[PDB]
């Protein structure tokens, strides 16, 4: 099953479907570097209170999630699954694909990321009481920008995060292991085609994204368990279901 020109074929629905399901365009991220956060602003963000900044970040956290949702409804093969696998990929995928995508909105020249329109770094977000979890994603997309990915790479990379046919839950296994596999081909078949292949051993391992994501749901259970009254009235519903429905709604949208 499934030739060369077909394989060629998935590489572009792909590389399409995600550049129209960027929140940010990369050429924006990239004119705005030389804005970045004065020590007055930062001084700001650090004197917020815990609860405001959990709130601020959940919101864009909730924003970032609803474009790969909608690159996942635009991923060929994704709505033919059923509801169920549907959801199951996007509970445990979503926030992977988004951790990917960040590496985009960060610099590396200076160890900042782009956050409410503004470059800052870690120090941005120390109000959280979060500073091991910060320092990991800060290390994680530093990581990935020393892979220097094409804009095409993380579209056939991001794909493949979201089309895991080992996630717990799934109906229909073979149905998202043949998906799986087509996007293995396009993603091996462009990095061969573009002579990147090198990049295959770099790539981060599948524990790393899972931990990353284990930290994120258990630094917001001790901070639910804190204020359970904000995270109940301010919290994005769409953010509560995935880390504490709305998946469904969206999906049939
Ligand atoms: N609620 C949130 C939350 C929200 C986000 C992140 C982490 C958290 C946490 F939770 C954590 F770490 F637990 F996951 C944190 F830190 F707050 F606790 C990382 C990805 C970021 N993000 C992006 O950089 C986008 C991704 C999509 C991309 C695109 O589609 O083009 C543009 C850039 C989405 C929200 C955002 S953020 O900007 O609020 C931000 C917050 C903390 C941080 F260390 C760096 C940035």
Redesign the pocket.
Known sequence: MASLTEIEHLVQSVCKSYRET???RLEDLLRQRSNIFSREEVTGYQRKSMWEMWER??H??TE?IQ?VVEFAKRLSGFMELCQNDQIVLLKAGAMEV?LV??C??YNADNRT???EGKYGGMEL?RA?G?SE??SS??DFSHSLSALHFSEDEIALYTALVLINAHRPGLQEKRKVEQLQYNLELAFHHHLCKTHRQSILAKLPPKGKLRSLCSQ?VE?LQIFQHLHPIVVQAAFPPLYKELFSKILHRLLQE
């Open positions: 960027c929140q940010l970040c959940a864009h956290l970032a474009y988004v995508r960040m985009r909105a990321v782009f956050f977000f959280l979060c979890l910060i994603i800060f994120h630094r």
